[PDB]
């Protein structure tokens, strides 16, 4: 029950028949029934900051006057 995922490669070795290029993957297998035992996957999501940067009721159009 292996999970195979890709690595985001930073420094690439001089190689494209083994390392740097042809997508380098890594493998994870969970050994425990409790998910709290799992390592962190770090495959995380981002979001728009608007709930903090623009919490105003009427939409902000930046080219327009904020007050109108």
């Amino acid at each position: 029950g292996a999970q195979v995922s890709s690595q985001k490669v930073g420094a690439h070795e001089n190689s494209n028949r083994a390392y740097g290029g042809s997508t380098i993957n890594y493998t994870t297998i969970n050994y425990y029934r409790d998910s709290a035992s799992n390592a962190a996957s770090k495959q995380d999501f981002s979001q728009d900051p608007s709930k903090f940067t623009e919490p105003i009721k009427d939409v902000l159009i930046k080219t327009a006057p904020m007050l109108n």
Binding site: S50, K51, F52, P55, I56, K57, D58, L67, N68
Partner: protein
Amino acid sequence: ACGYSDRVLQLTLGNSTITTQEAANSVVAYGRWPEYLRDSEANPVDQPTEPDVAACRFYTLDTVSWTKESRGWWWKLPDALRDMGLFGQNMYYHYLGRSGYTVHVQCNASKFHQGALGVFAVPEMCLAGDSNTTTMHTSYQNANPGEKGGTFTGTFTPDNNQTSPARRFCPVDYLLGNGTLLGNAFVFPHQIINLRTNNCATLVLPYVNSLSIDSMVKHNNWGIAILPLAPLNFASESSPEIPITLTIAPMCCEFNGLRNITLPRLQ
């Protein structure tokens, strides 16, 4: 076209309406409008009380006065509304309650006055105490002022009476009364009443907590902190004053665990 505008708003809840002609839009905290507790997040199983227009309406608290010496004001919610009509009664008759709010802060002046109030709504606004010999010692009575609220100070003054300690908060203004710098309070939902621009602040607050519902009598979910970011000034007068008025409406409030009424020790 018709002349609708950011600056001109009408708010109506229950039998009450607010108008404003110098608004600066309005804020919905964290983008979340208030809501009733969904079945998938529910927890007490008894059928809740939902007072609707009896409690979800604008209540105006006692007005305060802004002067050149004001350091700032604070209130806690639901505490500031504990004695407000049927909202207060439903709160004290039930073990549990939840509620969101529309907070409308009012402060007008003139085109020749200047000054700016930061109006911040803070989830879990824990404030620092007055003691350097005991921590977490502010009493229930001093932590809960009701509608009169409390004030910030520019100076920390430790209580040295160890015989009969005052047990109250000593909230320093530039430390947001809680040990963090006031310049960063803008990461909380807020507006600024800058007198040349606007005469009010409107904050719509969802119920926020680590639980779906909780004890309103034990726990305040939100704090309202109002501090002068720029001091009041006027023409060349040495002692100008202008009033600040708070009007707050509960929204989507619901209650569980009905019994006899809570009669709290408040003094």
